[model samples]
Target chain A: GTDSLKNSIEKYLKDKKAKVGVAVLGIEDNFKLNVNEKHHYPMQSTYKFHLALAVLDKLDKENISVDKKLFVKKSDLQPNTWSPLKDKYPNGNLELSFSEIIKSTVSHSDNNGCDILFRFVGGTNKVHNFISKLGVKNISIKATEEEMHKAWNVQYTNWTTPDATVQLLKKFYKNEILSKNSYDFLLNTMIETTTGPKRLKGLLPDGTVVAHKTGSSDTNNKGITAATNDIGIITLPNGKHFAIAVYVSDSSEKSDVNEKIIAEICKSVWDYLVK
Target chain B: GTDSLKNSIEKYLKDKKAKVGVAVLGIEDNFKLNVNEKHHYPMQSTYKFHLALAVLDKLDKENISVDKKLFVKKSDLQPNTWSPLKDKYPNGNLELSFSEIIKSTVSHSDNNGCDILFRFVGGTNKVHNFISKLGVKNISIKATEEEMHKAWNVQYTNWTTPDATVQLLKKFYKNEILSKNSYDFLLNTMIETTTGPKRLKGLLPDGTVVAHKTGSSDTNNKGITAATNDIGIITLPNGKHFAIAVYVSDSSEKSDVNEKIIAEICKSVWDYLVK
Candidate 1:
């Protein structure tokens, strides 16, 4: 249905500077574009969105409100990891709301917040179980943020194919994967995200809203960046939305270059779909 | 196709404190709901949106850039009007960009800015002609903000039916009415508006992006509010967009009630469409 659009997307990947996998799905149309869709890219912090959904689901069924406070001990706020939740409660003898954790983890991509949510949902395996139940394939959350921080390759275990990420995004957007309240809560939080502004929303017009998640990893000793990824729904000028996930892994490009490649590819999608 | 939604919209207007009209058209579907669609409601400041478009179109045709500066004499900045443009340039011996004037008029509802734009586009008749050429009917731009301020009844001369506003909005969103750059510029300015937060976006989730223009009128000595209106595209959770316009005019209700009526009706639309 979108032959030219698909080809335009492929044109951006000609550089081959990175192992890039992209999946674009029109929210209101039966249109899709998947390039390197089967490649498993290290999810990095993007898994936080999925983790938030599963945690919210677990809380919803348990009659535990997002407003319910979880006593976050100082020990839980690991040092050297990104955590606005910890920064707010430096001494960490504070009871933090689940909503705060989800916002920090998903919107801000706070690593400590991500692992905190993971533990609350009973572990990364439980997140995997919830996503598996939703019929989304090729998404595996095998380790916590802390675990990933401990071993470089551990993040790869928490992997998702571009197609898999978009499947989850589409289902979440359609409200099939979460309660109505949960769906609103998650998306409302996601739309405020500024972490991936230079990725999906970079090439779009100013003030264009995007609900997305960003995942990044440290460059290895040999100079390969394992993951520099962004996945999200882009709200077009006409208010039509399309879910797109771009993963740039094993790249020798600079950070800006990696992000710009994703931006250019996404701009291609926007240009085609604006018609 | 959405008869139940139509009925639900009617139910919201049962209070009848004001003459309320609503028009909603799904962007991706043929679904439409029009209540009191043919009712001639005074557009008040809502016409600023239409005015901005006409101004942009005129500038584009004349090869004039929005960034082009126009000298404003202190005499031209009329006092005792809603003019953020004037507020910023209280002394008024300055050059101002056309883009700044459009933002002030459309987003801030600056009365002076509106009149400046009206004069720049060669008068309100030109705006009417431009809109008429777009194949839309029931829209009249016969008066400027200053003209509307001259007499209470003069505001009524600047009118639009609910369906007419949505028709213009649909065309604008489809990029049939303006150039792409002009379309993005106008809508982006409209979305930053916080004037009618209690109207279309009132009952929706936080962070939901809505590109809308709002208009309100002063209550006369007899306690009748002539117009309280908003028109714009609402982005749904699943990424679908729907254009909606609500106008409340000739009401005996308080200003709060009028705005709330608009809010409740839009919320009803949202609830029904969520299904």
Candidate 2:
């Protein structure tokens, strides 16, 4: 079963010329699979998941109140960045609750909202420190959405090993790292995210609820993509769940091809773990 | 001399209802003057100075590079905040160097840029820890521009005693807290700052060079001004220097009056320390 699943995943990436990192865990059975999962890969916006975790942790501690209203200034919306919030209010200067900002960040991959939340809780180092205290490691976050957009190298600073990403997801789901409200909020936000429809949930049966975050980078002039990632928890037909992270780096393939590799991997993992 | 200086400062606030904190330290002689300098007051944006220091320290350590570019997307610019950078580029997706973002954070008092730098370095807690490692203490920074803009209460998360503010300034000026290049860059940026022109340097002689940071909150409808703060290293005409911090809180007076108190205090301190 393992070999078949693994072979199918490899078949999808056979001609993509990609360096791939993947990790999967069955929430019910502790079933695990990994490939190059120990190596670090540029997270792009996938780090937003970690950022959401950090923020929610702060919220649970009453260190930051979720109902707090933050002003989204006109300058907060960057041009060409993926942001539904900016699209909703292009002139900026909108007053949004902390919960609203988080929704925009997770559901829409709003770059402006990501930095706002990052700053709200104090910064990315705090996020690293927050998750570190929860006993998760092997991740480094040193840049913001702005920094990541500036240059290729800066994106590397906000990175995680695939295993680490799964570990974080496991800690979040298995352990009581977050309060009930925060957990539900984070999960619901991930489920509602509208950015990547064809990556993690593409091959799943219709109406599958997958709580996930996606990150993608523009291809360089040389046709190389440094990162394309999807990390999430998938709810199966029988109500069982699994956590998964797939990262493709240094790929020369087209965007949809990279996403298909992830989608195929998800399908394989689902077949292996859910059965 | 001390009594006269104290009397003048006291006289300015005699008729006004306000809570005030002030600290002055002569760089050459360590001559100090203080009023409620050990008491904590909301720092407002003044904490960005410490943020800048923390970031530059990371840069000096090679943990981050100054050449790094970050994207300031449309969502990072908040509405109604003071930001020349945003005013110049309203559509938001401007890519700037790390140094450029820091300059905007300090010199232009760009809240968006301040949060960007804050998130870049990892957050406010890291900034606090960074300064603490350098042997400065008695301050807390728990919120970002977004949080601060959200509610009046959020500003309290970032508070410092005037003494602590001055201590930080003193340490920066006296100790090898940063590389010479980083140090010069931060100081020169503060000097070239175009915000709060009439605060600390208001009453100083023409062409005076004051490397400083300023923070202010809008006067509420009820006329309660929660915080008006200025902290910096003032270069005297004789090549000597001094560190100063002035914070006015809970004032019912107009903003100009609050700034004038700072200017008057600066003039008095300049008169006393320069001799």
Candidate 2 regions with alpha-carbon error over 4 angstroms: A1-275
Cα-based RMSD of candidate 1:
22.8
Instruction: Return the top candidate by DockQ.
Output: 2
- lDDT (10s digit) by residue, model 1, range B1-275: 37877787687778777888889988887878889888799998889888898899888888899999878865455532445565466446688899988887787777778887888889999999989998999998898776665456888889999988988898899888778888899989989875666788877888888999888776655667788888999888898889999999888987567777888888888877777
- Stretches of model 1 off by over 4 angstroms after superposition: B1-275
Fnat per candidate, as a fraction, reads: 0.00, 0.00
Top candidate, metric lDDT: 1
lDDT of 1 at B5: 73
Model 2 per-residue lDDT tens digits across residues B48-70: 89999888888889766787889
Model 1, residue pairs in steric clash:
none
